[PDB]
């Protein structure tokens, strides 16, 4: 499908060279950054969407995540479906697991305190996570059947908000360097 949203946020630290490519393609070169999130997807997320992607390049030199990323409002929730990472595997409060698209994911919840949110400024909000137990190989056509995660999260009392914000396949980094090239559809 055609993506209609381009996400390019940085807290201003270091270098983040994000390129909005043709169609659903984008690339990012970063070094000695603070926090940043770059990706392509949809302006309005959906719990029934099936995301396809191909990471032609996934080379983080430190903390970085290759992950489905999005937000909901009422309540404010930042969610993730992490397929690969760099030197640090994200974790939090273990809830259970879910099998989807050939892999097994651990389900975690965490909370952010006085952190920047989608609406600007800072606040406290919950994060929902689905983290693959082992890194998903890149360079191939991958699929993320989001409904599987949404349903699994639901059975653990992890309900998403009613107002859906953007939903993208992103590259997130934290105080690191690296490169990525991803195509989303």
d(CA 142, CA 146): 13
Q: Is the peptide bond before 75 cis (omega within 30 degrees of 0)?
A: yes
179 C-beta neighbours (distance < 10 Å), count: 17
Pairing state between β 77-85 and 122-132: parallel
Q: How far is it, in rounded angstroms, from Cα 38 to Cα 26? A: 9
At how many Å resolution was this determined? 1.5
Method used to solve the structure: X-ray
**Per-residue three-class SS string for the chain:** CCCCEEEEEECCCCEEEEEECCCCEEEEEEECCCEEEEEEEECCCCCCCEEEEEEEEEEEECCEEEEEEEEEECCCEEEEEEEEECCCCCCCEEEEEEEECCEEEEEEEEEEEEEECCCCCEEEEEEEEEEECCCCCCCCCEEEEHHHHHHHHHHCCCCCCCEEEEEEEEEEEECCEEEEEEEEC
Total length of the chain: 185
Phi, psi of 147 (to 5 degrees): -60, -35
**Cα distance between residue 48 and residue 46, in whole Å:** 5
How many angstroms separate the most distant Cα atoms in the chain? 41
Give CA–CA dist 126/92, Å, rounded.
11
Domain coverage including residue 33: 1-185
Tokens at residue 43, please?
């302006």
State how many domains the chain has.
1
CATH of the domain at 127: 2.60.120.180
Catalytic residues: 78, 172
């Amino acid at each position: 499908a055609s993506t209609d949203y381009w996400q390019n946020w940085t807290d201003g630290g270091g270098i983040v060279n994000a390129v909005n490519g043709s169609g659903g393609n984008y690339s990012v070169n970063w070094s000695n950054t603070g926090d940043f999130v770059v990706g392509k997807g949809w302006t309005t997320g959906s719990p029934f969407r099936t995301i396809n992607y191909n990471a032609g390049v996934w080379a983080p030199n430190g903390n970085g995540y290759l992950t489905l990323y999005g937000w909901t409002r009422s309540p404010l929730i930042e969610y993730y479906v992490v397929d690969s990472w760099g030197t640090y595997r994200p974790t939090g409060t273990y809830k259970g697991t879910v099998k989807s698209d050939g892999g097994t994911y651990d389900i975690y919840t965490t909370t952010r305190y006085n952190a920047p949110s989608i609406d600007g400024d800072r606040t406290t909000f919950t994060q929902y996570w689905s983290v693959r137990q082992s890194k998903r190989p890149t360079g191939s056509n991958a699929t993320i059947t989001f409904t599987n995660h949404v349903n699994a999260w639901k059975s653990h009392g992890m309900n998403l908000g009613s107002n859906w914000a953007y939903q993208v396949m992103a590259t997130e980094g934290y105080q690191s360097s690296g490169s990525s090239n991803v195509t989303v559809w």
